[PDB]
Structures are given as C-alpha cells and as structure tokens.
C-alpha cells in the first residue's frame, strides 16, 4: 500500500545523465520540490583507511582520483603539503612548471564544466565544442607528462618530467591565442541567448548570509557578495607576479554563479598567456639528490600540514599528519563538494521546478567523487 498518497518520489539516480553519480531523492509536489535530501556515496572508494597503507611518495597516484575533472589539483595540493612537513627547497623551475600545469588543468576543468552543463541544458553545440577544445589541451598535456587524465606528475618534491622545449612552449602560445579568439563563440551559444538567461533567472536564490557560513568556498559564493579568492588572498605558487582581476557580484541567483565562472575562464586564460611570456629560467626539476633515495623508506619527521588551493568548484584542502615513518598517518582530502551541493543543495531545491533541478545541479559544479572520500 503506497503510504504517501500526496508526494511522488521521483529520484535522479546514477543512470540519468543529468546527475553524474549521486542520487538526489526528491519529494516532488506535482512539479515543485518540497523536500530534497540527497544520498551521495555511490562512489566511496575510501581514502582515509586506504591511503594510509602506501608509502609517502607512491601515495600520489592513488590520490589523483579524488577529483576527476581536475587531474592536477589533487596532486598539486598533496605535493604542497609534503613540501611543508619536510621543508624542501623546490626551485624556480619546478615552481613554474607546477604553476602552469595547475592553471592549464583549471582551464580544462572549466571546459569540462561547460560541456557538462551543455549536455544537460539541451544545447549540444556548446557541449561538443567544449569537449573538442578540451581535447587539444589533453593532447598538449600528453606531450608533457603522460596520459590524458590522471597524469601522475607532481611528486612531493618538484616534478617528474621537464618540458620538451620550444616544440612545446610555442605550442601552448598557439592554443591559448586560438582559444582566446575562440571564446567569443561560446558567449553566443551559452551566455547571450534569451533562452538560457530566461531559463536560469532567479532560480536557486542564494542569500549573502547563506553562503559564507554554510560551507561554500568556491567561485559560486563569489557570485554572492563575498571577497575571498585563495589565489589572491594567500598566493602559494607563482601567483603574486601575475596581477589578475577577480569577479565579484552582488547577485546570487543561478546565472550569477555561471557568468562568474565564464569570467574566471577569461581571466585564467589571460593568466596562462601572461605566465608564458615570462618563461622559466634554468634549474633542476627535482629538488634534492641525497634526501630522496631509497624511495619507499622515506622517514619524514613528525608534525602536520594543511594546504588548500583553488579549484573549478571549491577551495578544497588536504590534511596530512605524519607519525614519523614511511606512512601518512592520515591523509584527509577534503572534497570541495561536501557541503557544496549536499547541504546547501537541500535549501536550494525547495520550491524550484523540475526543469531546474539539473541546471541547479550543474550551477554549483557538483562532482560526485568529492562527497564520499
């Protein structure tokens, strides 16, 4: 006997192609939502009690898969944290390499978010273009380090493979100037039409006091009135000698949290163009010769370190503690989307129509491998 008789519970499970892999059970009321709780954790590999059993250097390759769209931001934060507890002397060349791959993976993640938004917003042309122009960035990463995604690159000191040379650094100038001439054809399909602007207007109204104390750390609370950019507040890599300008709006409906990410794509591509004309000087790619050998037996002195870094969706931190041996005692990777599309999504879908459940789901850039950890 069906014991609700009032509210039908359709729910977007995994096989839906709008939500990626996290089920949101929606207590629908005709065509609105009156209660939207989420069941995440269809992907819980475990990384607390799973990355505690590997040595310190080889715990990179196992830690990449905590966030799929950015295959460099999870390694470049753990590489920043094990940098701190040992206290290396990571040179200028390794700092520049890690800077440029941390920004080119970010423009890859923005392009993937555009393609993921357009696959569920109906319009396929902004999806196919976004994946096509992400593919040349993948084929440019493949010259450098290894595979397309999950390029195990940034070991705790420095990097693993340096630049090929003028065949590569001239090529990045070509694709960045190409995509900066190309980006004016994304606006006319995704941000200038009177469909999308009339589709995402006023849905999911996020207040100003509802973002800073809620768990939101990304660029989407920056569309609400909040002045917080971790690249600007505490620059970590070769950021202070860049002088980029960050966007802040006083709005907070859903399309405010989309135009801010479009402008972040524009200024980040201007960063990669500005970083390239600097060019890296000489130096080694590794950090030190004597305190790296016998690579499993890598006793680190005890203590702890926190690091945190800007992402496509949320400034998400790592937490490593070292007992004093060749094992991370606990490496916690705080997912960006833990209270960023699970808890704030519960008070965002209440009242919204069914057509703007997937669009709201992508207007926060919900990536399901981050809630579980």
């Amino acid at each position: 006997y069906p014991i609700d008789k009032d509210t039908y519970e359709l729910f977007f499970g995994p096989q839906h192609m709008a939500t990626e892999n996290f089920s949101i059970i929606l207590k629908m009321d005709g065509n609105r939502v009156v209660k939207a709780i989420a069941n995440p954790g269809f992907l819980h590999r475990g990384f607390e009690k799973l990355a505690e059993y590997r040595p310190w250097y080889t715990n990179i390759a196992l830690l990449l898969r905590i966030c799929v769209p950015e295959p460099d931001v999870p390694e470049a934060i753990y590489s920043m944290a094990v940098d701190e507890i040992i206290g290396w002397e990571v040179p200028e060349r390794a700092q520049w390499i890690r800077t440029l791959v941390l920004e080119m993976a970010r423009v890859t993640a923005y392009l993937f978010w555009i393609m993921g938004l357009s696959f569920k917003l109906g319009v396929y042309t902004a999806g196919q273009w976004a994946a096509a122009y992400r593919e040349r960035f993948m084929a440019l990463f493949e010259q450098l380090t290894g595979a397309r995604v999950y390029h195990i690159y940034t070991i705790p000191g420095g990097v693993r493979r340096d630049i090929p040379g003028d065949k590569w650094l001239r090529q990045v100038r070509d694709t960045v100037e190409y995509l900066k001439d190309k980006l004016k054809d994304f606006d006319n399909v995704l941000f200038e039409n009177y469909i999308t602007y009339k589709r995402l207007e006023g849905i999911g109204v996020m207040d100003k006091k509802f973002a800073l104390e809620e768990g939101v750390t990304g660029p989407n609370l920056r569309a609400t009135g909040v002045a917080y950019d971790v690249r600007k507040s505490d620059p970590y890599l070769l950021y202070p000698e860049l002088d980029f300008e960050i966007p802040v709006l006083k709005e907070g409906d859903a399309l405010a949290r989309v135009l801010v990410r479009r402008y972040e794509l524009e200024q980040d591509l201007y960063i990669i163009e500005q970083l390239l004309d600097m060019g890296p000087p000489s130096g080694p790619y590794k950090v030190q010769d004597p305190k790296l050998k016998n690579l499993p037996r890598f006793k680190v002195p005890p203590g702890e370190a926190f690091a945190h870094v800007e992402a496509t969706k949320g400034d998400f931190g790592a937490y490593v503690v070292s007992d004093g041996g060749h094992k991370p005692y606990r490496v916690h990777i705080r997912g960006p989307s833990i209270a960023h599309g699970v808890r704030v999504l519960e008070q965002l879908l209440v009242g919204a129509r069914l057509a703007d459940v997937p669009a709201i789901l992508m207007s926060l850039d919900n990536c399901p491998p981050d809630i579980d950890r």
Binding site: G41, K49, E214, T217, Y228, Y319, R334, I338, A339, R373
Partner: protein
C-alpha cells in the same frame, strides 16, 4: 605577523586557548574537549565564519580521536585548526554538536559519525543512511581497530582471478 595580533586578540577573549602561529597564516591551537562549544562562537563572531571539514585523526597508543576543526577567514585569509581530545571507547565517544552556530557542521558530523566512533547528541540526521549502507554501518571501518585484508577476505573469498598471491602488502 598579523596572525600573532589576531591570536593575541583571541586570547583576550578566552583563557584555555594556547595559540601557536605557524608560517604566516596557519593559526593552530588546542582546547580542552568539552569547552569548544562555548568557544567556537567566539571564533565565529570574531572573524572566522566559514568552517571546513571536521577531520578527525585517531591514535591507538594514547586512546583519543583528536577531532581537529578547520576554520578559515574571509578578510585576511588565515585558517584555524582548533582541536580537541575526546576518549576512544564507543561508550565515551561523545561530543556536543555545533549546529546552533555553524550550519556547516550539519553534514561533516554525519560523515565523521558514520565513518568512526563519535556520536553527536543534539542533531537529527544521525541514524540516516548517509553513506556506508548495511553491512558496513555495523562496524566503523576508519578507526585502527578495523584492519583491512582480514575483512576483505571475509567479504570476498579470492582477490585474484589470476595466480599466486596478490593480496598481501609490501
């Protein structure tokens, strides 16, 4: 430097707050266990609204789940690491929930309760199947009393479709 002034301003408003300032902005300090509830809103109202994950390390030698609490700033950019030390038995795994001051800890406490140990009193989403459905909820797999490769053998008989012995370590 400015973090030393910030922690000096915090220590005026709280006695049990021994603040060590790491590199420039990593203001880490420990408080006693059942005193942070009357303390975290001093940290909220001063300058730190946003709360990151309630990450909790374990220690089998001295039995205590050291729940470190991650706070962050928005006007300066620092990141507090206020930490407690509560006992390790499931009987004594008690900790008052921070939901009246932070709605950030509505969901962080669900993961730290379903993963290992700690039970939070004044919250409603406690016995909800958040993650780790049955039969994984019946034992807490993220402490140090739960070892891998002797539960995985009792859940899956073979770990290699192929040959000899790829299930041990090192």
């Amino acid at each position: 430097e400015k973090g030393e002034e910030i922690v000096k301003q915090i220590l005026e408003k709280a006695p049990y707050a021994e603040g060590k300032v790491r590199r420039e902005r990593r203001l880490e300090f420990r408080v006693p266990a059942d005193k942070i509830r009357d303390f975290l809103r001093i940290m909220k109202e001063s300058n730190f609204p946003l709360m990151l994950q309630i990450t909790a390390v374990d220690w089998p030698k001295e039995g205590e789940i050291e729940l470190v609490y991650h706070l962050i700033n928005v006007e300066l950019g620092t990141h507090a690491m206020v930490k407690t030390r509560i006992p390790r038995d499931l009987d004594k795994a008690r900790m008052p929930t921070v939901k009246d001051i932070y709605p950030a800890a509505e969901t962080y406490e669900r993961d730290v309760h379903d993963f290992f140990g700690v039970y939070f009193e004044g919250n409603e989403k406690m016995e909800m199947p958040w993650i780790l459905d049955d039969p994984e909820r019946g034992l807490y797999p993220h402490r140090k009393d739960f070892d891998m490769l002797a539960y995985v053998k009792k859940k899956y008989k073979i770990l290699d479709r192929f040959d000899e012995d790829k299930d041990k370590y090192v």
